[PDB]
Amino acid sequence: ILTIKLFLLINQFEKQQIKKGRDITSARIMSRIIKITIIVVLVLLYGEHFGMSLSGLLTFGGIGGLAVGMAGKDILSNFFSGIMLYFDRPFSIGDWIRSPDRNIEGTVAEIGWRITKITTFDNRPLYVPNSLFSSISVENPGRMTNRRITTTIGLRYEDAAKVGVIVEAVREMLKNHPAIDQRQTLLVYFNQFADSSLNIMVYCFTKTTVWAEWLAAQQDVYLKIIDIVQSHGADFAFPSQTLYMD
Amino acid sequence: ILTIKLFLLINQFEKQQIKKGRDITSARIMSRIIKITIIVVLVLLYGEHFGMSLSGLLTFGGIGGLAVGMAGKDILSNFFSGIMLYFDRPFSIGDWIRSPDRNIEGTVAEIGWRITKITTFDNRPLYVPNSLFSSISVENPGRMTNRRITTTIGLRYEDAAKVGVIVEAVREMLKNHPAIDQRQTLLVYFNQFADSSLNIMVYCFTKTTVWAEWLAAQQDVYLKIIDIVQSHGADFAFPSQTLYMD
């Protein structure tokens, strides 16, 4: 009677799957698989009243369960990480996330039990297995407080007498710029002997976090830097070489 | 009687395989393998009425099942991932899919219990084990909403006085182009001091998702950009060098 009840239940499931709309052969194969699995489980559970030697079933079930346990580790790990994400999540829907270990960059669209769906920046869907969120570092640029501007000014080696005044002028310009956050790091220093130029680092932050506003402020700063450099008699350096001719 | 029944059943299977058309020696070898496997399973299951010490079979079966369990992990994992794909699939037949972790690029042709068959873009079949779809990220360009156009305009360092007007002209041209989606990102800014040029980024989207239409729109935009740049007196920059002669 137990076998009849289980068979009728999975038969109802099978016609349910068919009515949902699916290939018939696949439904038959899945129904079989469930049939054999249920039969094996019942035989192992109900194998003493009409059963066998109590040593054979132990070994057989141990081998089968051991093989199944190592075979299904990844599928179960994904769902376990999904439960963990449900309880403790480092991001929310709509957050732009990133990782230095794997390519998962994009904005979160859906968080599921098995995979997370993320919209990339070329408008494509990306499906990430949940287990990855248990072994890699996740960065959240969507929760940033400032946008950083970093650049290098490469002057000619013959402009060594004007490095200090140029550095001071650039620092003053950055300090008086209305779009620059004055409570964050602000460094302008000459710090590198390059192959063909003397390099000056520029390192600052903007108040805004909007993409277009940050880009506009960066462009304005770059143009002002060009004007400052060219007004002091210096110039930017191309790659240079010394040629000896026969 | 059980052994006779099983032997006759697998013999019928063996002649079935032969009639299907296959090498005779391979069929004999497979029949043997099944013979020995069935004999071992029956001995371990039926080893108490005429059997042995109830400690030897436990150890023997444990060792055998442990070895078999670790030996067959990959084959069973592929089928488990096939079942998972049957129930929860991130793609469908005819979808162009991709992955940043492995080379599986192509359009899905068949989804099976063990492997997935994908048609590559040089018209070749590729067979991907199903377990890969449980540990890697899958991108679906076949479900994209827009096609992206990104490029860089490199102007000469002597064209620094015309960057703003060129940027404004390019932005206006992109804003008035009938093939550009105006509800998506649209950025045109000067954002890089390159080695030999000043770089302007162009970043926009098209309404269409068709390959040929997107390529045609991109070509039209590129030609218009060339005309705009050349009409303002600027020019594109080749790699440049400064040479000092003895």
Swiss-Prot record, chains A, B:
Question: Keyword annotations for this protein?
Answer: Cell inner membrane, Cell membrane, Ion channel, Ion transport, Membrane, Transmembrane, Transmembrane helix, Transport
> Which cysteine residues pair off into disulfide bonds?
none
Q: Does the keyword Kinase apply?
A: no
MF terms (GO), sorted A to Z: identical protein binding; mechanosensitive monoatomic ion channel activity
In this UniProt entry, which residues form the Cytoplasmic topological domain(s)?
11-37, 81-246
The principal location of this protein is membrane
Membrane listed as a keyword: yes
Where does this polypeptide localize? Answer: Cell inner membrane
Q: Which domain of life is it from?
A: Bacteria
One GO cellular component, as annotated: plasma membrane
In this entry, the parts of the chain located on the Periplasmic side of the membrane are: 59
Q: How does it sit in the membrane?
A: Multi-pass membrane protein
Question: Which Gene Ontology BP annotations are present?
Answer: cellular response to osmotic stress
Transmembrane annotation, as ranges = 38-58, 60-80
Assembly, per entry: Homoheptamer.
- Into which family does the record put it? Belongs to the MscS (TC 1.A.23) family.
Name the job this protein performs. Answer: Mechanosensitive channel that protects cells against hypoosmotic stress when highly overexpressed.
UniProt name for this protein? Low conductance mechanosensitive channel YnaI
Which species does this protein come from?
Escherichia coli (strain K12)
Q: Taxonomically, what lineage is the organism?
A: Bacteria, Pseudomonadati, Pseudomonadota, Gammaproteobacteria, Enterobacterales
